[PDB]
Enzyme design. Structure first.
Site, PDB file in Angstrom:
ATOM      1  N   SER A 148       0.685  -1.006  -0.093  1.00  0.00           N
ATOM      2  CA  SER A 148      -0.038  -0.164  -0.133  1.00  0.00           C
ATOM      3  C   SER A 148       0.895   1.254   0.101  1.00  0.00           C
ATOM      4  O   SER A 148       0.750   2.305  -0.887  1.00  0.00           O
ATOM      5  CB  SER A 148      -0.973  -0.141   1.329  1.00  0.00           C
ATOM      6  OG  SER A 148      -1.663  -1.225   1.540  1.00  0.00           O
ATOM      7  N   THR A 149       1.880   1.183   0.814  1.00  0.00           N
ATOM      8  CA  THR A 149       2.759   2.191   0.976  1.00  0.00           C
ATOM      9  C   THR A 149       3.596   2.302  -0.153  1.00  0.00           C
ATOM     10  O   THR A 149       4.049   3.670  -0.568  1.00  0.00           O
ATOM     11  CB  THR A 149       3.613   2.038   2.289  1.00  0.00           C
ATOM     12  OG1 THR A 149       2.789   1.200   2.999  1.00  0.00           O
ATOM     13  CG2 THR A 149       4.202   3.137   2.783  1.00  0.00           C
ATOM     14  N   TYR A 157      -1.404 -10.168   4.951  1.00  0.00           N
ATOM     15  CA  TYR A 157      -1.463  -8.762   5.086  1.00  0.00           C
ATOM     16  C   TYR A 157      -3.002  -8.443   5.387  1.00  0.00           C
ATOM     17  O   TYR A 157      -3.816  -8.351   4.444  1.00  0.00           O
ATOM     18  CB  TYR A 157      -1.014  -8.092   3.709  1.00  0.00           C
ATOM     19  CG  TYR A 157      -0.938  -6.479   3.873  1.00  0.00           C
ATOM     20  CD1 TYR A 157      -1.340  -5.736   4.789  1.00  0.00           C
ATOM     21  CD2 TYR A 157      -0.795  -5.854   2.598  1.00  0.00           C
ATOM     22  CE1 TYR A 157      -1.257  -4.370   4.785  1.00  0.00           C
ATOM     23  CE2 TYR A 157      -0.588  -4.507   2.781  1.00  0.00           C
ATOM     24  CZ  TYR A 157      -1.003  -3.720   3.706  1.00  0.00           C
ATOM     25  OH  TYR A 157      -1.127  -2.143   3.780  1.00  0.00           O
ATOM     26  N   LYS A 212       1.112  -9.569   9.030  1.00  0.00           N
ATOM     27  CA  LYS A 212       1.079  -8.078   9.132  1.00  0.00           C
ATOM     28  C   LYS A 212      -0.174  -7.774   9.885  1.00  0.00           C
ATOM     29  O   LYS A 212      -1.127  -7.832   9.306  1.00  0.00           O
ATOM     30  CB  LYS A 212       1.398  -7.577   7.716  1.00  0.00           C
ATOM     31  CG  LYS A 212       1.943  -6.107   7.932  1.00  0.00           C
ATOM     32  CD  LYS A 212       2.003  -5.339   6.467  1.00  0.00           C
ATOM     33  CE  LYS A 212       2.304  -3.771   6.283  1.00  0.00           C
ATOM     34  NZ  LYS A 212       2.039  -3.079   5.062  1.00  0.00           N
ATOM     35  N   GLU A 245       2.186   4.218  14.692  1.00  0.00           N
ATOM     36  CA  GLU A 245       1.994   4.993  15.829  1.00  0.00           C
ATOM     37  C   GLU A 245       1.656   4.321  17.272  1.00  0.00           C
ATOM     38  O   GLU A 245       1.407   4.991  18.362  1.00  0.00           O
ATOM     39  CB  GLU A 245       0.727   6.143  15.786  1.00  0.00           C
ATOM     40  CG  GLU A 245      -0.348   5.475  14.830  1.00  0.00           C
ATOM     41  CD  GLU A 245      -0.218   5.262  13.436  1.00  0.00           C
ATOM     42  OE1 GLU A 245       0.671   5.148  12.895  1.00  0.00           O
ATOM     43  OE2 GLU A 245      -1.498   5.531  12.774  1.00  0.00           O
ATOM     44  N   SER A 296       5.696   2.396   7.176  1.00  0.00           N
ATOM     45  CA  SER A 296       5.851   3.359   6.295  1.00  0.00           C
ATOM     46  C   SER A 296       7.147   4.729   6.676  1.00  0.00           C
ATOM     47  O   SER A 296       7.798   5.199   5.503  1.00  0.00           O
ATOM     48  CB  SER A 296       4.577   4.086   5.770  1.00  0.00           C
ATOM     49  OG  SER A 296       3.979   4.585   6.786  1.00  0.00           O
TER      50      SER A 296
END
Lengths: 299, 295, 293, 294
Positions: free
Chosen positions: B46-47, B136, B164, B191, B207
């Site tokens: 995705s990143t 994922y 993941k 985060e 990311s």
């Protein structure tokens, strides 16, 4: 804001015992308050959702509040959850709270109806007004209230004059950490018990919860371990809590803990109030198994 | 798959003014993660802007990165597409290029059943021809909303090696860690890293790692010798950065920083992603001088 | 002219999951006869997001050979990528299409502003074709506000909204706010209701099996035959019940198999096949549907 | 329970500036509803600010309504609380005022097992004592996401003769109606009333009917003759107001309009509802005048 430093700690969310007729089991309540204090719990958060507030009256709630001042005042901390949908009902309990000696009040974001954020702050201020200088614990629980506050909103909710802490019953530790960073001395209560250890790591300095009524102690050790820097048994304590938390989701978090405490013999009738049903039969085996287990690891 | 345990950077994919693959910048960014101290790479996620690239594009990236990095670190290949056959084409290509593993987001947009998800993953693990597969999971962006057992079943699937976990639920993180003691469990959200570890993850794919992946190994170190205060301080300095990225738009922010770190040349994401707002640059410009000086 | 009951075309594949050109063709025809005002080409129902750009272009061309000048043909060129959407658009022009379409780009969080550009680029690349702005929160997670909708349906170049939402209040605020705007109901299952709140058309999947049944809902409402509409919608929903339970796309393809239109009733992987046990009802359904028209 | 079928106003609860129940404006608003065309009134529901009143207050409201309306029109007591027994107390009470129907919202806040709902709805039927029940469903505010089977099992509990369907999913509305040809079926969202009647709904219970129930009764009519064009115009005008009442806030907004029409003395909602905005007064005023004439 600084005045609320003391409100820091592991506080139990007291259950309300009921008799064969659904009435307040006044005797079983009295016991539970002790069962809690001899565990070494820092304090009790009285008449919250765990406490079954919302299937009780302003009067009935007030009896509990009262029957718990007689017992636990002076010794441990008493926060009174005075929250109702009506602001005036809330201020009645806030003042009854001031009366009965309580150390703080608290109110769930009022719910069912879609109030604005300005309306939310007016609800809180008015309960603080009636609090006559008792600290306020804003009580944030999206799962169950349906309320959805931004970060900025939550920042504004906690810098209202007279706000002393935050029950954060939320699973977002990005936000939990953002709240710490922002208000470095705020008293930040982790609210979901299944992630205490984790919540403490993000900027909590304590918590509140329902599971404590039968294994409070486990939660204090986690605080100790973190202070120490012993990341290892911290995870042993979180991990064992969730094997119990796991089963209390399967049965019913309130009628499970009460069907436990009936086996520890601190409740004559493990019932919750209708519309909540009786616990299912086949869990009794393991529930009986868990009381029997938990009594011995304390003593 | 302990070989897979680690801090893996979700590699970004560089483009040029004309939106074309920037291979110069791809190679540099690969080196800047090696020299930075990362354990590995997760390519074409995705990143990496996987879903705005053609298969051929996702292949040329894979190839380059194994060229620049094979033998030097772990390399995971995100080969996931909505289609099983597209996804297998890329699994084959990753095997060809010498990759250590493959990964694939739950296939999305259309509703698939959990049986259909598993068969998707059976078919891929096979065209992968011996590479172990990282399941994922990113429910907020995929829109697939897996139960606990379902996730226990995906991870015991033949030749699945890791998960993941791009989830915020550190209760489910514990229930996986407590139910699959060995499993390589990657933390997805940058985060909650510190707390995702505590809950039971052994590493992460992320990311922002592309710019401060020491700060996350620094989180891991700090936690392993019980220095909570440095660890929390790091996460905090991570989120400070994540607060800015969330405002600027995370990928384009992250690239624009490497554009000030001289790595990436055009700091673009592909349309319909837009440019970073001109107003945010000094803050990004000086995040970079800040960051270059810490390394 | 974009106004009408415009069937969302399925892409029939052969046993190797490749474009079954013959069936594709048989479905364009098999639709054309139903009365359908047009066919929606390369939308979601067309299994588009599991085709390459080439295969999608392959369909746009074939269909535009079977259909152009006979019925209405709308080309859905939307991908997540703007560049890729642009390509399928310029193609849709070349093959002489009536309109292009493009579902809000999905997966990544894009700003509404970013969305807006997406459509601006695609309206340019469609070189003078009009755009059907294609809303669908359920599957794309894009949660559009009325105000955001208002600007999008009035971007210079746009000419219609595919309103794939079961929110019939918002349908009316939109009909209200753009009284001319062409505006298709998207849920096959509330079509009746949707024209009532003010859709004047439908782009739908299940039209491939019963365009007329939908057309005859439009009739009754137009003719104030309120009793009829319901009856129909109810039989139009007794199927949708079935199809939702079967797997919808496969369900429709199969029914077209038991109608002798589609050689092999298959969708692409990861969509697997229709459970065996539902084949009788689908067969009965197929052989109840040829009776009517 | 076919007699319960129709357009019912979800009754507003008038309060004074002390936030005390305003009893003279209640009776007035009841008379204004009756004078207006209404088939019946639905009392002390969400619109009636139920969940900021005590049981006492809820009982005193009902009593005033049954004194004023019984016989004349149909009467539905929303007796629903979180607790079954509070619902049970309001239930019997509701029967002492000789009401036609009892109702209750699916209990909220705490997550209840479906089973635990079904029993709740039975315990209230028992106490209702021959009064039919109106299963009141409203996922958006209750957070209770009922499925189809679940719902079908509810509305066939013995004693249940209505469903209030305040869900905007008109496909579900048809499934319920296809499965239940005789069930009374109250549309709950006023802004899709026409569309919901078309889907199945043969009735309506709503908050805006307190200021224009005649428009809603005309939709039923318009539809039944097969006049779609007026059903349309009516719903579009009904919707113009809701746009208004959402900006100002809906209950207070309506209380204000109701004030201008000489019905309610003080247009307050109970805290934490705020007062309406001064800037909206011109238009709210202007809406009343428009409607009195029409």
């Amino acid at each position: 804001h600084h005045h609320a430093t003391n409100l820091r700690g592991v506080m139990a969310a007291l259950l309300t015992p009921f008799d064969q007729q659904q009435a307040l089991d006044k005797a079983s309540l009295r016991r539970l308050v002790q069962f809690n204090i001899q565990q070494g719990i820092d304090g009790l958060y009285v008449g919250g959702s765990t406490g079954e507030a919302f299937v009780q009256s302003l009067s009935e709630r007030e009896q509990v509040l009262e029957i718990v001042a007689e017992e636990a005042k002076g010794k441990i901390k008493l926060i009174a959850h005075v929250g109702c949908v009506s602001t005036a009902e809330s201020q009645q309990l806030a003042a009854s709270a001031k009366r009965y000696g309580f150390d703080a009040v608290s109110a769930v974001t009022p719910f069912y109806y879609p109030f604005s954020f300005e309306e939310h702050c007016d609800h809180y201020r008015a309960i603080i007004d009636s609090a006559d200088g008792l600290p306020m614990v804003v009580y944030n629980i999206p799962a169950l209230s349906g309320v959805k506050l931004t970060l900025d909103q939550i920042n504004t909710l906690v810098t209202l004059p007279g706000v002393g802490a935050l029950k954060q019953t939320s699973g977002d530790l990005y936000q939990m950490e953002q709240i710490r960073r922002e208000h470095p001395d705020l008293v930040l209560y982790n609210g979901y018990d299944e992630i205490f250890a984790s919540g403490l790591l993000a900027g909590a300095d304590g918590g509140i919860g329902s599971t404590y009524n039968i294994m409070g102690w486990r939660y204090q050790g986690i605080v100790k371990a973190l202070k120490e820097g012993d990341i290892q048994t911290a995870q042993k304590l979180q991990t064992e809590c969730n094997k119990v938390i796991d089963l209390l989701i399967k049965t019913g978090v309130f009628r499970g803990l009460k069907t436990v405490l009936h086996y520890m013999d601190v409740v004559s009738v493990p019932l919750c109030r209708k519309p909540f049903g009786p616990v299912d039969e086949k869990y009794l085996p393991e529930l009986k198994a868990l009381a029997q287990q938990l009594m011995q690891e304390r003593g």
